[PDB]
């Protein structure tokens, strides 16, 4: 099928681009390095494949879509459940993803673009709110029979994720601080879930 070939070719460009971002470095890689190694399976084409920043965000689309499915699947896998169980189940999956060398490597790429005068990153964040894992949590909060949880669902979602994820990821990205092993992951999830539900007057 024509359509299959197109998509398969788009997958070749992204794969070349990722390998170059990892071996050669994001900053020293130019569009042309990517077109070159893509061969005559590119020659000046049409999508967000018009700059290396565009390719980079086409890759994140994929990864975000991959993490969302992963985290949704693990949550709905309960038949239950107490908010307690739902929060920790989400905890575990979310935290696990941020403790992969991959999450740090892309983190470094995002932070280096802080001076980008084309706002590719702002466009991307503004056009993908729907695709972040925060929405899954935001989804469970509304359903709970509660005035507060329903009214503040987006904020509690965002807060719980942040407590789980910062300042660790930040330090991972800037100074290469070590990741958590799985025991530390688990430990830190129960910690955060306790304070979130019951607070430090327990």
149 part of the interface to its own copies, by CB under 8 A: yes
C-alpha span between 106 and 56 (Å, rounded): 9
Could you say which of ligand TCH, its own copies, none residue 60 binds, taking C-beta under 5 to 8 angstroms by partner kind? Answer: ligand TCH
Q: What are phi and psi of 50, to 5 degrees?
A: -130, 0
Q: Which of 6, 166, 178, 182 binds its own copies (CB under 8 A)?
A: 166
| Residue ranges in 55-84 that form contacts with its own copies under rule CB under 8 A | none
110 part of the interface to ligand TCH, by CB under 6 A: yes
Could you say which of its own copies, ligand TCH, none residue 176 binds, taking C-beta under 5 to 8 angstroms by partner kind? Answer: its own copies
Within 8 A by CB and 6+ apart from 9, the residues are 41, 42
108 part of the interface to its own copies, by CB under 8 A: yes
CB 105 within 8 A of CB 22: yes
The full 3-state SS of 77-97, as one line of letters, equals CCCCCCHHHHHHHHHHHHHHH
Binding site as annotated, residues: 64, 133, 165, 170
Binding site as annotated, residues for cholate: 64, 133, 165, 170
């Amino acid at each position: 099928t024509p359509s299959q070939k197109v998509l398969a070719r788009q997958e070749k460009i992204k794969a070349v681009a990722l390998e170059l971002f990892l071996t050669k470095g994001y900053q020293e890689t130019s569009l042309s390095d990517i077109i070159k190694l893509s061969g005559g399976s590119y020659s000046n084409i049409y999508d967000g494949f018009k700059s290396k920043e565009g390719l980079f965000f086409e890759i994140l689309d994929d990864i975000c879509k991959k993490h969302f499915h992963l985290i949704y699947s693990k949550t709905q896998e309960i038949k239950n459940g107490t908010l307690k169980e739902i929060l920790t189940s989400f905890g575990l999956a979310f935290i696990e993803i941020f403790n992969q060398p991959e999450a740090v490597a892309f983190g470094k790429i995002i932070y280096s673009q802080v001076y980008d005068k084309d706002r590719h990153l702002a466009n991307w964040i503004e056009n993908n709110q729907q695709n972040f894992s925060y929405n899954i949590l935001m989804g469970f909060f509304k359903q709970q029979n509660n005035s507060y949880m329903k009214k503040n669902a987006e904020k509690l979602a965002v807060l719980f994720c942040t407590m789980l994820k910062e300042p660790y990821h930040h330090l991972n990205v800037l100074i290469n601080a070590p990741l958590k092993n799985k025991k530390e992951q688990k430990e830190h999830v129960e910690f955060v879930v306790n304070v979130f539900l019951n607070g430090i007057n327990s």
